[PDB]
Design a protein around this ligand. Sequence first.
Ligand SMILES: [K+]
Ligand SMILES: [K+]
Ligand SMILES: [K+]
Ligand SMILES: [K+]
Ligand SMILES: [K+]
Ligand SMILES: [K+]
Ligand SMILES: [K+]
Ligand SMILES: [Mg+2]
Ligand SMILES: [Mg+2]
Ligand SMILES: [Mg+2]
Ligand SMILES: [Mg+2]
Ligand SMILES: [Mg+2]
Ligand SMILES: [Mg+2]
Ligand SMILES: [Mg+2]
Ligand SMILES: [Mg+2]
Ligand SMILES: [Mg+2]
Ligand SMILES: [Mg+2]
Ligand SMILES: [Mg+2]
Ligand SMILES: [Mg+2]
Ligand SMILES: [Mg+2]
Ligand SMILES: [Mg+2]
Ligand SMILES: [Mg+2]
Ligand SMILES: [Mg+2]
Ligand SMILES: [Mg+2]
Ligand SMILES: [Mg+2]
Ligand SMILES: [Mg+2]
Ligand SMILES: [Mg+2]
Ligand SMILES: [Mg+2]
Ligand SMILES: [Mg+2]
Ligand SMILES: [Mg+2]
Ligand code: NA
Ligand code: NA
Ligand code: NA
Ligand code: NA
Ligand code: NA
Ligand code: NA
Ligand code: NA
Ligand code: NA
Ligand code: NA
Ligand code: NA
Ligand code: NA
Ligand code: NA
Ligand code: NA
Ligand code: NA
Ligand code: NA
Ligand code: NA
Lengths: 186, 260, 72
Amino acid sequence: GIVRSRLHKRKITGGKTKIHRKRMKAELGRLPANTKLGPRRVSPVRARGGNFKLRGLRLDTGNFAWGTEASAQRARILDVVYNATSNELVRTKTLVKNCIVVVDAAPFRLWYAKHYGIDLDVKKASSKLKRKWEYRRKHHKIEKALADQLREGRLLARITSRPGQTGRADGALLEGAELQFYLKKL
Amino acid sequence: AKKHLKRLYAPKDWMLSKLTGVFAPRPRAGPHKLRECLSLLIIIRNRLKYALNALEAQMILRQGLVCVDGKPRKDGKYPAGFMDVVEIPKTGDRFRILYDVKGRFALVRVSEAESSIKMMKVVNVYTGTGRIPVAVTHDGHRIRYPDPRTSRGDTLVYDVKEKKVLDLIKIGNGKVVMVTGGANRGRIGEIVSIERHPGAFDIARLKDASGHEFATRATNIFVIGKDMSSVPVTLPKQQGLRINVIQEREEKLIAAETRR
Amino acid sequence: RGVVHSTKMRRSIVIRRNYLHFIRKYQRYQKRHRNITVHCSPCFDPKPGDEVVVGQCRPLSKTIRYNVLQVV
RNA sequence: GAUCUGGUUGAUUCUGCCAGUAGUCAUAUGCUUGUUUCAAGGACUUAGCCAUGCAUGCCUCAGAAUCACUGCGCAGGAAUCUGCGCAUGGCUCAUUACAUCAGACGUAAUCUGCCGCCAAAAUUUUGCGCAUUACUGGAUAACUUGGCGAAACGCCAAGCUAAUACAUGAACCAAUCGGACGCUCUCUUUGGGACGUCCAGCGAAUGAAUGAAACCAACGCCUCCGGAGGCAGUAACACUCAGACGUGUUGACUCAAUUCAUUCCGUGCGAAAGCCGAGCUGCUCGGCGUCUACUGACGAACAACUGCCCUAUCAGCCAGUGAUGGCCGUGUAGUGGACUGCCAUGGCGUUGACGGGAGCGGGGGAUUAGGGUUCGAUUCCGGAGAGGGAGCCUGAGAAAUAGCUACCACUUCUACGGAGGGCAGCAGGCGCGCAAAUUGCCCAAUGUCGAAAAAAUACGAUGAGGCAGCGAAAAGAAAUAGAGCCGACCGUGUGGUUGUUUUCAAUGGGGGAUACUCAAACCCAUUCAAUAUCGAGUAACAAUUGGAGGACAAGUCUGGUGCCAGCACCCGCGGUAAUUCCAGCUCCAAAAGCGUAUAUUAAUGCUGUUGCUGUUAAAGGGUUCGUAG
RNA sequence: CAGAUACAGAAACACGGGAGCAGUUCGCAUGUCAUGCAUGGGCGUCCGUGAAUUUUACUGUGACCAAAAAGAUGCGACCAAAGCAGUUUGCCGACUUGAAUUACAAAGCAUGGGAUAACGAAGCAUCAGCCC
RNA sequence: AACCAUGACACCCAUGAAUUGGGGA
RNA sequence: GGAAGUCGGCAAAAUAGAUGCGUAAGUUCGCAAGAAGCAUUGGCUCUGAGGGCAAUUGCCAACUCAGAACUGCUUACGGCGGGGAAUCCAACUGUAUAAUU
Ligand SMILES: [K+]
Ligand SMILES: [K+]
Ligand SMILES: [K+]
Ligand SMILES: [K+]
Ligand SMILES: [K+]
Ligand SMILES: [K+]
Ligand SMILES: [K+]
Ligand SMILES: [Mg+2]
Ligand SMILES: [Mg+2]
Ligand SMILES: [Mg+2]
Ligand SMILES: [Mg+2]
Ligand SMILES: [Mg+2]
Ligand SMILES: [Mg+2]
Ligand SMILES: [Mg+2]
Ligand SMILES: [Mg+2]
Ligand SMILES: [Mg+2]
Ligand SMILES: [Mg+2]
Ligand SMILES: [Mg+2]
Ligand SMILES: [Mg+2]
Ligand SMILES: [Mg+2]
Ligand SMILES: [Mg+2]
Ligand SMILES: [Mg+2]
Ligand SMILES: [Mg+2]
Ligand SMILES: [Mg+2]
Ligand SMILES: [Mg+2]
Ligand SMILES: [Mg+2]
Ligand SMILES: [Mg+2]
Ligand SMILES: [Mg+2]
Ligand SMILES: [Mg+2]
Ligand SMILES: [Mg+2]
Ligand code: NA
Ligand code: NA
Ligand code: NA
Ligand code: NA
Ligand code: NA
Ligand code: NA
Ligand code: NA
Ligand code: NA
Ligand code: NA
Ligand code: NA
Ligand code: NA
Ligand code: NA
Ligand code: NA
Ligand code: NA
Ligand code: NA
Ligand code: NA
């Protein structure tokens, strides 16, 4: 079948390798996944040494982390926005590692108001929490490049998993000069 | 995934004749390496002639008469290695597996108190889930909470009947070692020094008791004690002292002449 | 160790190894050589004709198997 | 053993090749062969074609028995389901030069059943109706009732019943530790404490932290109700624990490991909802069996530093469609141009690339002053294949040939609808050739597999393996006679000797056991009385194969032929007296052996590094310049 | 004595997670809500940081190397080709052996520095006292 | 028969008469 | 069916644009050569490359080439080389019997 050996390539001198022995199972490959975007569906692949991989087909949502605040939250993926391998991957709405996507940002608006008391269920709050917010508010600040995004309810993020391998779509928000990189890029 | 062992490919220390059969018993995986061990069927049938054929060893081993670490073993192809106590309670004899002065396997009769003691060489120290320091041993045992001073090269004195550590003997120049691989196997001497060579094999320079000098790779010494006297275990006849080949030949010749 | 031969790639150089082989019958030597391609990080900056020390790695390409440490 | 000899001339001294000579576990053919020991044996050519039979299965005290099975309720248990194995062994050498392999090393780039040490505190369940606490559910074989089909390792429907197959599901009584809230209670002035609620097990994914070692304002303490010091001591942490980690490992880590946040839905997790011994429904002790997590060993795959015949009447090779490198990606167990998209223009070569020829690598054999030349299909290690060539399921591990699917070439049975076959496994046949063995016995030894020690009211398989039949491949021992007697002598100077008569002991070829061997038979090894056991005398128990001019040991013998017939490896012999042909008689070599043919090593200083030759014998370029060397 | 000249793997600066109680050489007292049952003048160690900071071939000796085969050490398998076994003027045993080698080239620790070869230089391209 | 049928570079090596070119006395 | 017709393949049929690859004998080294031969081609929805002017931004122009997904065929205007192996003659381009060469 598909093979991963080197017996078919050319030598560095340009010569042609003569092949003795038949094909072996240890170097087999398999057809890719081409993970789309939609309702979740997976298939079990029996790997080497027992085990199983989650071939992800049309995943829908995943866990997106917030590095600066050391937090994570479950959010939905709206659409893929950027890819670096090819433009054709964006059009087909495929999911692979390091894609640039957009997420709802409604849950993150909930976390920020709960954690800090700033809303972009707040008046109802005990006096202990009503004094803790000012403590965090004193020694923590936020950037306009992300304050504006939360107001608009649409956040840019990047995938950080292998959907055709682990069957998930995890990621992290874009902050700092990296975010300004893609903002100019779009 | 091999399952046989041709006679000619077997280790020489088993001393199996090349005219008797074509195959040898392949040692199953376990505490000691295939090259650096001898099986239980070998000991029962070839060292002590309790059993004549290989069917008789089954008639002994399948009953659990033979013990190898305080637990009876029923597998003939069990791998038994250096510093292992073999006791047959019915016959009452206990042997410890050691190397003789020529690098061959030696079984020396030990006492009752000695048979409960075993020495182990640390090879790796790591942490388990939680914070559990567990140290691996040259025979594969894992010790759950060793002395926090234990390191790679040291050795542990172990009680087998009840599982606990007696004491830890670290490494250093004063201590006495025994060479466990490399054609110097079976020599006792002190640590003159050890050379580092980072990224490669350390070289340890040793001095024999008779003032001779010899060297070997640092991964072949098994520190026994801090002095020759303070040895927790017994020792073979020669005490690991090798002498000249011509002197060996001459002593053997005259000894045969006085004998007859 | 070897001598840097070509630096036409990107973050990659070619080094030449010169040695002598001994033929038993004629009790004499003969020059030989072997070519080896290695990866060179931008911390260094070797010119053709220098000497480099290289250590093994994991396969980084079809041919590259060594990495450059301590150009001299 | 550091050796040489015949042929060019009327003679001589050379160069030089032909011929002689000794080996070969090196093949074949010819002649001849009493004993015994040890032994290779259809590679060579045709990896050509194959009739028939056998080669891989396994049950203990310890998964599952209502055989309409057997033996006097107890035992033995045919048959099927479940667990493990069949990827090992055996055979062959077709392919193959940055491949395979050998010496040295790696995986910090990974997977890993059986084996060895060893770990486990998540889970609201069941009976009664709120008190109690593991007697959980359905189905399916084997069977019998109909059967189909010419077969065929063919197949259908109905009715029963198990589990260590399958599927659910266990509060109990079980610790330690940490986060987030309430506008619930208490005190003084996040203050603190409590009460309530939610989350907090192993493993996986994502993100953050640790993974060290180079004068004031708030808090602690002391001193003298409340009301004021000013720094002696003092690992830290607001009590339940005044040390319950301030310290993983490496040559090196984005590794080991800890805390926090948001998440795993089948593609993971048990106390088998179990099997035997006992001891005393109702308890105690002891052997077993199985899920999941972790790291040692037996392994697997991949990378590879150096080396390995002949050829230039093979000089350039590589890039659309991957060639050399870069960047995010995808596939894999994992790295990688292994692969998709984009980018750059590289990589190799007279130190022989690219192409062609012969060829499985090595450990090693033959020949040996020394240096060398040559062989290696073949018993150990590694690789590869199962008529030709490709795909894949199940497994921890296969791209498996006594697994499946298809196509190509040959091929078997049939009722003409169809169904099969794979000896480069064992023995055997046809063909091919100069050329190679019995259609034998056994699990006794050596081992592998297994649910197994051996013994019984109760015998695991195994052409792997071993044993014997055939066998001048080759190798080791070794008979075919020893002492005298009396004449006849031969030479030499009285002492070996050469036939003629004739005794006199000894021994094995030959044949037989009280018997040994043997897994059973055979061969060795013992022995012809231990009261008590067969046998050489023209020793018909009869040694051959090549030669006698030279090389080269051995006849100037006797008949026949007449440049004929023939010999002769080379020089030569034969035309009427042949030292050479065909024969008789003698003799020589070596001997149960000896000739012939082909290949190869030494002879060969006729391939010369040690160590050749080049004025005239073969051979110095027409002369200068000149780069790699 | 020191220092000063040469030489130096070595010299200066630090590490108490550094030398199984912080190496070697010139039992009162602290604590006591305690298992607190505890503690009671230079070298040479160790680990990091800066000056300094030569490599190869050849030769000696070690490291590291399946067996079978090959050389061989020991033992009348009746000898030998073989094989690792076997020997007691006898008992319920004793002595036990099975040594030790080699290796095309490459590889790896350390000794010398004679013959060698790899770098560098082309000398005005160089100028630089030390101490207080 | 492009011949000395005699490749290029370097060292040592016995005598007596001549000859071509330069130099010293 | 495929030159059997005929003095004779006369006449007809037949090839055909463009793009990528590939191309022999012979040779005066220029050629032979479009030698020979193989593949692709529609419609629709997109993507990339190739520029100018003002202060990294803004505005603006030309159709060429390359690539992808989906979808379809009844092979579907016009225009547009059939090819190969040889023999004889003349080297070649050219001229030449207006009205049979
Ligand atoms: K196959
Ligand atoms: K056969
Ligand atoms: K005879
Ligand atoms: K004759
Ligand atoms: K010659
Ligand atoms: K002149
Ligand atoms: K043409
Ligand atoms: Mg996500
Ligand atoms: Mg002549
Ligand atoms: Mg054949
Ligand atoms: Mg076991
Ligand atoms: Mg539990
Ligand atoms: Mg629970
Ligand atoms: Mg071949
Ligand atoms: Mg062959
Ligand atoms: Mg083999
Ligand atoms: Mg077969
Ligand atoms: Mg024959
Ligand atoms: Mg001859
Ligand atoms: Mg004559
Ligand atoms: Mg020869
Ligand atoms: Mg000349
Ligand atoms: Mg010329
Ligand atoms: Mg041997
Ligand atoms: Mg006609
Ligand atoms: Mg026409
Ligand atoms: Mg041409
Ligand atoms: Mg064309
Ligand atoms: Mg014309
Ligand atoms: Mg006209
Ligand atoms: Na039973
Ligand atoms: Na049962
Ligand atoms: Na054979
Ligand atoms: Na195979
Ligand atoms: Na065949
Ligand atoms: Na087949
Ligand atoms: Na057997
Ligand atoms: Na056999
Ligand atoms: Na010679
Ligand atoms: Na000549
Ligand atoms: Na002797
Ligand atoms: Na003998
Ligand atoms: Na011998
Ligand atoms: Na001449
Ligand atoms: Na000439
Ligand atoms: Na014209």
